[PDB]
A paper describes a structure:
The versatile nucleotide excision repair (NER) pathway initiates as the XPC–RAD23B–CETN2 complex first recognizes DNA lesions from the genomic DNA and recruits the general transcription factor complex, TFIIH, for subsequent lesion verification. Here, we present a cryo-EM structure of an NER initiation complex containing Rad4–Rad23-Rad33 (yeast homologue of XPC–RAD23B–CETN2) and 7-subunit coreTFIIH assembled on a carcinogen-DNA adduct lesion at 3.9–9.2 Å resolution. The coreTFIIH contains two helicase-family ATPase subunits: XPB(Ssl2) and XPD(Rad3) in human(yeast), and 5 nonenzymatic subunits: p62(Tfb1), p52(Tfb2), p44(Ssl1), p34(Tfb4), and p8(Tfb5). Altogether, our study illustrates how the Rad4–Rad23–Rad33 (XPC–RAD23B–CETN2) complex recruits TFIIH to damaged DNA in 3D structural models and provides the groundwork to visualize how the NER initiation is carried out in multiple, coordinated yet distinct steps.
To better resolve the disordered density, we refined a less populated class containing Rad4–Rad33/DNA at 9.2 Å resolution (Map 2, EMDB-22588), as well as a class containing Rad4 BHD3 (but not including BHD1-2 and TGD)-Rad33-DNA at 7.9 Å resolution (Map 3, EMDB-22576). Compared with Map 1 that resolved TFIIH at high resolution and yet had a poor density for Rad4–Rad23–Rad33, Map 2 clearly showed the elongated density for the Rad4–Rad33 complex bound to DNA at 9.2 Å resolution. The previous NMR model of the Tfb1 PH domain (residues 1–114) bound to an N-terminal segment of Rad4 preceding TGD (N-Rad4; residues 90–104)61 was placed into the density, guided by with 9 and 6 cross-links formed with BSD1 and BSD2 of Tfb1, respectively. On the other hand, the BHD2-3 (residues 489–632 of Rad4) bound to a segment of DNA at the lesion (at positions –1 to +1) were located near Ssl2. In between, the DNA was locally (~3 bp) unwound at the lesion, as required for the simultaneous binding with Ssl2 and Rad4. In sum, our model shows that Rad4 binds TFIIH at two points of contact, straddling between the two ends of the horseshoe-shaped TFIIH: N-Rad4 (residues 90–104) contacts with the PH domain of Tfb1, and C-Rad4 (residues 648–664) with the C-terminal helix of C-Ssl2 through Rad33. The DNA in our TFIIH/Rad4–23–33/DNA structure shows that the unwinding is extended (positions from –3 to +1) compared to that in Rad4–Rad23/DNA (positions from 0 to +1). The relatively small size of unwinding and the absence of Rad3(XPD)-DNA interaction indicate that the structure captures an early step of TFIIH engagement, and that DNA unwinding is needed even for the initial loading of TFIIH.
Author numbering:
A (entry chain 2): 7 to 286, 328 to 507
B (entry chain 1): 465 to 519, 537 to 567, 573 to 639
C (entry chain 4): 22 to 94, 113 to 323
D (entry chain 5): 2 to 67
E (entry chain 1): 168 to 214
F (entry chain 6): 107 to 457
Amino acid sequence: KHSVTQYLEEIPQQVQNRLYTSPATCLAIYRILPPLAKFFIMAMVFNENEVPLLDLDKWVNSNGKLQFQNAIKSMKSLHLLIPNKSSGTLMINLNPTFKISLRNALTGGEVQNSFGVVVEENVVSLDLLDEYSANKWETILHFMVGTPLAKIPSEKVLNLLKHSKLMEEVNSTGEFKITNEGFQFLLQEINSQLWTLLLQYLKMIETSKMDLVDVLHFIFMLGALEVGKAYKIDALSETQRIMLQDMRDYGLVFQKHSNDSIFYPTKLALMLTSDTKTIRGLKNQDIPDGSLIVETNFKIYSYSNSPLQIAVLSLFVHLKARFVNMVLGQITRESIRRALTNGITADQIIAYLETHAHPQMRRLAEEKLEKKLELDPNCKEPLQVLPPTVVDQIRLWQLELDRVITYEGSLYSDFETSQEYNLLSKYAQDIGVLLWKDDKKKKFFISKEGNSQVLDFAKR
Amino acid sequence: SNQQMLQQLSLVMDNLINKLDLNQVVPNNEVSNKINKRVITAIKINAKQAKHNNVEVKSTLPIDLLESCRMLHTTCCEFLKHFYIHQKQASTVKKLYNHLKDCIEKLNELFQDVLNGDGESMSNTCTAYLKPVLNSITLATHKYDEYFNEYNN
Amino acid sequence: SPSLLTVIIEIAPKLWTTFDEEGNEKGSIIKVLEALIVFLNAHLAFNSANKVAVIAAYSQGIKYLYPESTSALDMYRRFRNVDETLVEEIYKLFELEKKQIEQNSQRSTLAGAMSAGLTYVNRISKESVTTSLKSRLLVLTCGSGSSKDEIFQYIPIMNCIFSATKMKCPIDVVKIGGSKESTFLQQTTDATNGVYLHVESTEGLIQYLATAMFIDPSLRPIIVKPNHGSVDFRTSCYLTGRVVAVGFICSVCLCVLSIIPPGNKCPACDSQFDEHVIAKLKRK
Amino acid sequence: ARARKGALVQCDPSIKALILQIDAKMSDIVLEELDDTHLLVNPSKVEFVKHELNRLLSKNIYNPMD
Amino acid sequence: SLSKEKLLTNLKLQQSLLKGNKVLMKVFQETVINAGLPPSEFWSTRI
Amino acid sequence: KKRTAKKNITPYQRGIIRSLILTLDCSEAMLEKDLRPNRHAMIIQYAIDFVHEFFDQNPISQMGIIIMRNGLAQLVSQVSGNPQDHIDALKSIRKQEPKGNPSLQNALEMARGLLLPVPAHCTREVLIVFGSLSTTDPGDIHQTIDSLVSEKIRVKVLGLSAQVAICKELCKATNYGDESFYKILLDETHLKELFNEAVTPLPVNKINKGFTLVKMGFPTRIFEDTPTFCSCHSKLVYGGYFCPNCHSKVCSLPTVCPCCDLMLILSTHLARSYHHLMPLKTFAEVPTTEKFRSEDCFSCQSRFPILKNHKNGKLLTSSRYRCEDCKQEFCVDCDVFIHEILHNCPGCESK
Ligand SMILES: [Zn+2]
Ligand SMILES: [Zn+2]
Ligand SMILES: [Zn+2]
Ligand SMILES: [Zn+2]
């Protein structure tokens, strides 16, 4: 995941404030920050005066300081605030545009942008054009992955996929195949897929007539809530209107026909930020249609099905004869070796199975779950909540094809005496952060938690 | 005032509400920055005080010895507070009381020796560890003295 | 982690007048109402779209405000619907006021309010088995005079406490009125892991609210903000009325009695006692 | 604050020596060799290191799988 | 079968119980071997 | 079609204090295969549940646990008021496996010995979870039963899948003759509810007995943290309670003061008692066609009332089970919840 939040902080500060002028964008980005930062920001928003950092330290206690650093580093990186070495101290305060926009949003501000929606006869039916948006999303997914017939006419969308290198397909020969990007597209279920596509449209649509402030205004206004009336008609910039038409083509806009009307708020824009339920001629009833198969016997038992879904399953398992409720497929080392040929790591698939194919594995994941977390301290043996056997077999296939070991962290030095090194090693063993250590070299390559805690203890 | 003025004020408020109003912008925010500050002061004061609740002795051998002394004095006082309540075995109570006074003096000498040898900080820790039991036995002694004076005088 | 903050605002027009009587009449409950609306919106925004609920306690009963029982049969705009609906309901309730309303001043239905709110929490939690709701309710009371401590509600309050603890539902309380520490409420917040706030009258609470009435959803690594000690030296003697320390509690009656036994038939259950037992007590 | 970042590699010393050989063949991208069991490398070229490792192991073993 | 005076006089039983717990024998001796308590009442607590 | 208790006819007295001595059964019989793991494992699991429950609802009582292995009764938890000790003891047992024959007589005698210190106002009890179909006694049994009933010791037993004559005699004997206490089970859920109904205090129609005022005092929490110091376990504990009279620290409990030996409680225990003394009238199920009341809930706001004329559906019933004294409706969920968890009737509180 490119972690669009990282792209957000990527952009410079002045354009960040340019975006913060739009209160709805302020709210939407408030939705994204880690909870610690959320709470701290909500504290600061009202008392119109900077605050010393010492208070914001003493606010948090023990065994939870890691999140303090997470929040402060994130917020500084995206520069929502302005640290102030006023008297040599730290006089924190938000980018005041952010503060005022947010406060306006909380109590009836002047955000005509966020208020761009119009209330009228929302003749849009729940299934009404919702099925059409779902069908468009399925069509583009199939065309990108490659179906027997790809009716994907998104010439702009195809150009974005190709130039963006969305999938390892020979666009010169017209191929739309799964690359590392294609593997990720197979991985990111909904939010991941929509996010990758939005980032691709951003990167491709970045040359001329961008108006990035208007771009994000339109995007978040779409994700915020149903603008409905007068959206497409009134509430859009010129380039904003063009981007809206393009998104509506991309499915992310459920604009009605007649090419001129209010905004058509498809559920997809909601899906962009919701991180919630995923379900979308005139028939389609399934809260658990996807009937995948995955047990301890490493077999594929399917009753429920979805053609693109089962094709995704086939992307790492053989197909011989499609059946009524089943499809001939058995997951083996060869089955995942198919994706290993694409170099697909046995990592995304883990959480994928934990999440996807569950419409047919609800009872399976419940019996594996068994609520064996509160019962874990008492009964020390887990009831295969997340199947470890399958994980071990997958790791074995991955190991069979790999043979290389790597570690994260950074090399450390200036352990002048053996006493500091030994005490830090003991503390790390207490906290389980030392990958490896040696007093002879006074060096190691681990996470920064031990150094952080020692420095905090020393300075304060 | 009740009844009349009650309904009066009630209606006044009802109106004020109905009188558009409810300016959540005007909702205090904090109004007086000073008032705000004062509220924060109160709250940080309380946070500090309740935080003072951090939910390890030095001389392990003296610690165990003091623990033995505490157990001893505890059971001794146990027997008194049984007997001093219950009742005709007065002489048994007398023996218990004399022994308890002896134990109190013993612990006093113990504290003296601790202050002499372990110094002050360790002696301070010992005194802290033994404060509750010491207070209880002292109170028992005082209560017996009061009861004995009452019976005698 | 969604939370169901179910405020319980009591509004006694008697106590509303007392609030006007207290200090000056420099502003009716309107201040409290507006601050409550804002705080409610704040919580409604904070989490991932977690419901709320509000109940009242007028002089002759209680009635819901927000969930808006079947009647026909801006900013995110759901804030809009919640707030406008609440205010319409509350104005309707204020229409429900007259002399016959002035009549039944004998009681104060706060206990009914808390109990019903807890029932509501149970309803919502039970229906929403998926995505378990870390719920927790609130209490706003206009502290008035004319009764130093009404006690005829003592038991149902504690039953509320025990229900809360079993249901794992912290219950925070904000008393606005005279410097009379609402003992039962104080024990309620302290026991059920809550927070007590005895504000002065006319300050715009919104700061107090958003500070110390927003940290109870599903956090609890954070020091609560309770006032001075919460002594559990409990109820005064039923016969006497002076707070007891070394109690003297009868029997199956369970009433707590002072050092003054009437010698027979503890004055809450007709149970004559063993005069031998009476003498045994008198053996001191 | 001293934190020397890189691609830390830890394995058996024989595989470490083989990795050093390969790395020298591909112009010594290994930043440091912390000990007989740890290596500090630049993550830029570790991927092609693994690629060439796969190539040479396929060349040698060939997986008869008889 | 079991009586207060009976357990009081069950000296062999009492010494067996002394053998029962190190903590027990320790506290007992330091209440006794320290010129402290007659065992009678000491058990009168522990009946 | 209803399954309700008609009326409660001892809503005047219960044993509020208790000293219940649960006695399990760990003997070769309990190793048969009728309950899912066995008899024994399921038994001990439910025993843990019952321990938690009972020490909740009767938070002022004590309890002791007794097994019956190899014809011997080996006490596995002294009679004590701290649930955690008993919980741990049961944990330990559950990993150990039964043997020998159940010696009901020995267990009975051990109990009768065990409950002697319990004072007169406290009430005694035993709860035999008898699993087998035999005993093995080293003495006369009717001798023991007579001694028991002489010592005013009610006994309730929960046989497994049979009825044993002697046990029936035992229950009928100690409980003042009135036989209702030998309930035996026919299903696991029946077993859960068996323990549940064992939790509550036990009235039948109490003979006029001595009723006695009991001295006790309440503690006040402590403040300091570093001054950690304890007088009931002789440790350092960051802060606890003070006996109002003995005036010595005591680690958190409703326990008895270990210095001056008087009972300690806060009140909430007394509140639980109050809840048990005077319960509510069982909520009535309103007539299907004669109700004509509000179409909602009252405590909650449910939309489950009727359907208005639907051949058989409306002919079924009208979910309006409504309490008497307040005469307000309540949906089934609300009534179940009120009568199970919180006993303040919503409407009946408000008037
Ligand atoms: Zn203790
Ligand atoms: Zn005491
Ligand atoms: Zn209901
Ligand atoms: Zn009722």
